[PDB]
């Protein structure tokens, strides 16, 4: 048989590439608005939720957008002054002086600051993280709502989604689907309970890199949402403080009525039913032992409490009432409001979240749960699972676990007799390239780099084909005979009962071996023609 070059082959390899956000018609929609799906029969791929790259790109893209969106906003470096704070409870009435819009005049102002937002230096205080970070007020009239964000692959790449319902996150998938853009991924911020996520279709899904390793957070996806309604019941009045030419500093002031506590309600009915289901499921994935739950260990109020972000107000709700051992009721959780918060900890940056008049309410759907396992030689056959926080990428591993990014690779060199998107991935070689697959190779600075790179890969494949005498045609018979050492297989074995992927795995060792022969054969043919 003789070498034969096929262009537009449905095969791929794992790779790292720049994607781009799309969103739907704000911090995110400053992304270009759009989602086709096609099932891939007979295809099995080894997915990996943990060694993925879309989480490591989603993290950096959240950092980049949060830094970009907070550049034309106020900087509270003039506000780092001594604060005369008295009791108004966890709230302090703080009086201080400022350099007003007329610079040679000083004005005394008042503001209600929470005790978590100030540290002492008596009654003299300063705003927390002034002497380590540069606080930046979150801009009003620009909402920071987590709108759904799709991830569309660039030219020459594709995204495979695993449709197996019981898929835990690692290993083979029963049947997959190539898509352009992922589903709406709300970029939520949480610590111990994943909020507003995607529910599991049929069953509870538990995942870790290795359960016997204890430094590795265990993700648990609920197939049934648990309602959670939470609220800040204080009647705040927002006061504007002018500190410069167009810079305004919004503070709380003069709460009206009772100073009530922010609480976070969960229902004792649906909760502990879902938790008993989780307990039943975690019985099987270990040696038989009693499965039961403990509160969080010591740590930063950022990890010891279920934190999130509701309407720009940062809640820190204790979860000791959830993970401590059954009828209808309510599991009302105390919460602490924090204004100066530094999430995704950047040394030298903070964030003053401005206050809101009236009250707010926070209704969300718990669709997940992050856990960890205590170790030691504790015997007694009971495993103590505590909630775990920090390492923010986990919150986007729960939404990017079905997806995988693959690099499409043409030039599937196979032998034949002659000489001289991804719909057919699982199909055998016997019984379309130009119509469907090949046209999909061209159809800020990040998304410009990925498009220039798409152009380079299209030219670095088209030039190879042109140098192998294949300028205008997709299938070429070539003048290089098929060696016996290149895993010699019969035509029956190859073009029947064997898919393109297994063939790609078969002769991956002979890359840059047939290529040199093709170059020199084309050059020999042309130099014979000219002579």
């Amino acid at each position: 048989l003789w070498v034969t070059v096929y262009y537009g082959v449905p095969v791929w390899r794992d790779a790292i590439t720049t994607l781009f956000c799309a969103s739907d018609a704000n911090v995110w929609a400053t992304c270009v608005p759009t989602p086709q799906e096609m099932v891939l029969e007979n295809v099995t791929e080894n997915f990996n939720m943990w060694k993925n790259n879309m989480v490591d790109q989603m993290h950096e893209d959240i950092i980049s957008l949060w830094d970009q969106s907070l550049k034309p906003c106020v900087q509270l470096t003039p506000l780092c002054v001594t604060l005369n704070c008295t009791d108004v409870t966890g709230i302090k009435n703080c009086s201080f002086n400022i350099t007003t819009e007329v610079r040679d005049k000083k004005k005394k102002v008042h503001a209600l600051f929470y005790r978590l937002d100030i540290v002492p230096i008596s009654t003299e205080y300063i705003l927390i993280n002034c002497n380590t970070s540069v606080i930046t007020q979150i801009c009003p009239k620009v909402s920071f709502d987590p709108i759904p964000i799709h991830y569309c692959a660039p030219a020459g790449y594709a995204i495979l989604k695993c449709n197996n319902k019981t898929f835990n996150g690692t290993g083979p998938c029963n049947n997959v689907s190539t898509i352009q853009c992922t589903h709406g991924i709300k970029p939520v911020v949480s610590t111990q309970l994943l909020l507003n996520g995607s529910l599991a279709e049929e069953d509870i899904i538990i995942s870790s890199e290795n359960m016997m390793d204890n430094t590795k957070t265990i993700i648990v996806h609920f197939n049934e949402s648990v309602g959670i309604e939470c609220t800040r019941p204080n009647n705040n009045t927002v006061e504007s403080i002018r500190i410069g030419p167009g810079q305004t500093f919004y503070v709380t002031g003069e709460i009206i009525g009772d100073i009530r506590q922010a609480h976070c309600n969960i229902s004792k009915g649906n909760w502990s039913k879902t938790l008993q289901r989780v307990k039943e499921k975690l019985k099987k994935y270990y040696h038989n032992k009693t499965i039961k739950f403990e509160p969080s260990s010591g740590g930063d109020l950022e990890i010891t409490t279920h934190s999130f972000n509701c309407r720009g107000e940062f809640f820190y709700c204790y979860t000791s009432g959830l993970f401590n051992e059954g009828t209808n009721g309510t599991i009302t959780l105390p919460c602490r409001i924090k204004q100066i918060v530094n999430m995704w900890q950047k040394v030298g940056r903070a964030m003053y979240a401005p206050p809101i008049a009236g009250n707010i309410t926070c209704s969300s759907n718990i669709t997940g749960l992050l856990l960890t396992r205590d170790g030691g030689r504790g015997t007694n056959g009971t495993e103590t699972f505590r909630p775990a926080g920090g390492n923010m990428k986990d919150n986007w591993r729960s939404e990017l676990y079905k997806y995988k990014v693959v690099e499409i690779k043409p030039l599937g060199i196979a032998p034949t007799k002659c000489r001289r998107f991804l719909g057919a991935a699982g199909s055998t070689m016997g019984a379309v390239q130009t119509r469907q697959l090949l046209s999909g190779f061209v159809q800020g600075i990040k998304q410009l780099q990925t498009r220039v790179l798409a152009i380079e890969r299209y030219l670095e494949v088209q030039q190879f084909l042109g140098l192998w005498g294949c300028s205008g045609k997709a299938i070429c018979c070539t003048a290089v005979p098929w060696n016996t050492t290149w895993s010699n297989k019969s035509e029956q074995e190859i073009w029947n009962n064997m898919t393109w992927m297994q063939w790609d795995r078969e002769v991956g060792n002979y890359t840059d071996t047939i290529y040199k022969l093709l170059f020199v054969a084309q050059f020999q043919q042309e130099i014979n023609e000219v002579d």
Partner: nanobody
Amino acid sequence: VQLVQSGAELKKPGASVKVSCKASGYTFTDSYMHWVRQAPGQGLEWMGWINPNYGATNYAHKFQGRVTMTRDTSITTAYMELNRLRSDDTAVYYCARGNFLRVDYTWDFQHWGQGTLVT
């Protein structure tokens, strides 16, 4: 990697010790600070690790409730406070940095500090 630990002293029943593992010369934030208990002429034990960027800590089932592991990142010094010590707490105490610090992802404790032999 420089780890400079503190000095030991016999603590009576009901006291509290605060041993330190002052680090220098590396990325302290992206580094676990596991603690290890050496029983006297006997096998070691795993007290607990402390992620220092968030304080997220996990102790052993044996010492769960009796110990607490604070960390300071400004001066890049991790802490370990042990209350309610008894006379059976005779041991040595070291701090090991590993768990993906080295090439392998599994717990591969390389650098160790100076020891602390609180009885």
